[PDB]
Amino acid sequence: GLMQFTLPVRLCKEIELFHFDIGPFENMWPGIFVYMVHRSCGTSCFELEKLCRFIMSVKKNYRRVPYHNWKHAVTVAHCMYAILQNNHTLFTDLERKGLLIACLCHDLDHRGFSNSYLQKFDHPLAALYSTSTMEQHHFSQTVSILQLEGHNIFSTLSSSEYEQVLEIIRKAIIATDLALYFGNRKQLEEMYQTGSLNLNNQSHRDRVIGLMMTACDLCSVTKLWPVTKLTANDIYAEFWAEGDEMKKLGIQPIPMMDRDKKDEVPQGQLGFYNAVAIPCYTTLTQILPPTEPLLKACRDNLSQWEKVIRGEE
Ligand SMILES: Cc1nc(-c2ccccc2)[nH]c1CCN1C(=O)c2ccccc2C1=O
Numbered sequence: 001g002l003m004q005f006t007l008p009v010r011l012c013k014e015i016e017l018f019h020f021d022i023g024p025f026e027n028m029w030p031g032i033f034v035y036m037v038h039r040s041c042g043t044s045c046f047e048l049e050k051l052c053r054f055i056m057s058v059k060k061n062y063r064r065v066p067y068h069n070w071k072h073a074v075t076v077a078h079c080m081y082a083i084l085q086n087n088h089t090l091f092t093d094l095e096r097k098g099l100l101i102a103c104l105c106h107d108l109d110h111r112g113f114s115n116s117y118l119q120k121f122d123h124p125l126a127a128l129y130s131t132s133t134m135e136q137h138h139f140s141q142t143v144s145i146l147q148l149e150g151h152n153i154f155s156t157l158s159s160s161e162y163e164q165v166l167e168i169i170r171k172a173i174i175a176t177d178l179a180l181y182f183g184n185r186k187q188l189e190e191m192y193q194t195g196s197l198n199l200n201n202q203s204h205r206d207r208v209i210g211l212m213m214t215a216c217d218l219c220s221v222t223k224l225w226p227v228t229k230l231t232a233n234d235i236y237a238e239f240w241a242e243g244d245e246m247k248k249l250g251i252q253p254i255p256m257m258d259r260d261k262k263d264e265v266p267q268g269q270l271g272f273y274n275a276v277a278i279p280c281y282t283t284l285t286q287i288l289p290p291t292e293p294l295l296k297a298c299r300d301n302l303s304q305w306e307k308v309i310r311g312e313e
């Protein structure tokens with residue numbers, strides 16, 4: 001009960017910042033996450049024994065893939081922590097609880113392949129879940145881990161609060177399907193501008209949480225340039241393996257997944273910042289002003305990719 005996690009000074013300070021990198025020491029990641037839950041949620045939010053056992057079972061159900069791995073889970077959870085800490089009063093007790101866990105669980109049992117490759121392969125998951133295939137799996141896996149003996153971290157919620165939190169986690173995880181992001185942001189864009197956006201309206205809150213999830217999920221583009229550039233290598237390592245597997249099915253992959261088109265990465269990054277990342281952090285900053293450092297860092301990284309194309313790096 002009186003048992004806080006404490007980080008070294010450099011981490012205690014930098015963890016509060018949006019651009020924090022959780023470092024290469026895997027064995028510190030569980031304690032970093034508990035630390036973030038304790039400060040975000042409270043030392044009483046979760047029985048520490050049950051939380052520690054949930055965290056180690058989540059870790060075991062992430063695979064050794066170049067990008068969609070345990071490091072990503074904790075990185076996405078830290079971005080959510082930074083958003084919640086800069087927006088203290090906008091979120092309920094249940095939401096602070098549910099979202100950090102949602103982020104930790106959001107890519108459980110990822111195989112390093114997109115929804116499209118599952119459909120073209122005719123994977124069994126694509127017959128069980130026709131849309132948002134992997135994201136319905138990540139939620140399924142999250143519920144399975146919650147129901148292991150000694151793993152139910154929500155045990156001390158009422159029946160209605162329990163159902164509310166699983167509903168928050170389900171929507172938060174489905175929202176990480178980037179195919180749903182385009183329409184969610186446009187609806188939020190219209191609502192913010194026409195002035196109809198109402199945070200007491202549950203369907204509006206749902207949309208805002210969806211965009212927060214996209215923002216945390218993409219947060220590699222909000223790090224300092226050296227972190228962003230080295231993460232890009234892991235992202236392409238997965239995509240190019242998927243492209244290889246497309247060629248094995250007799251299907252030309254899109255250029256993003258074709259290792260032969262490595263040369264086009266800098267221009268592919270520009271499209272991605274302009275079509276996906278910048279709009280995401282712009283709409284999020286309009287709705288949640290204190291998240292502006294995410295937009296600022298994303299713009300700095302756009303400018304670094306522009307330098308790459310001009311042969312200045
Ligand atoms: C859209 C896109 N097209 C190309 C490209 C095109 C042609 C040739 C080579 C590359 N690259 C990209 C961006 C790659 N990318 C994602 O897709 C993504 C998703 C979530 C987080 C970070 C990322 C990220 O970096």
Ligand SMILES: [Mg+2]
Nearest residue numbers: 106107176177
């Ligand atoms: Mg995902």
Ligand SMILES: [Zn+2]
Nearest residue numbers: 106107176217
């Ligand atoms: Zn993810």
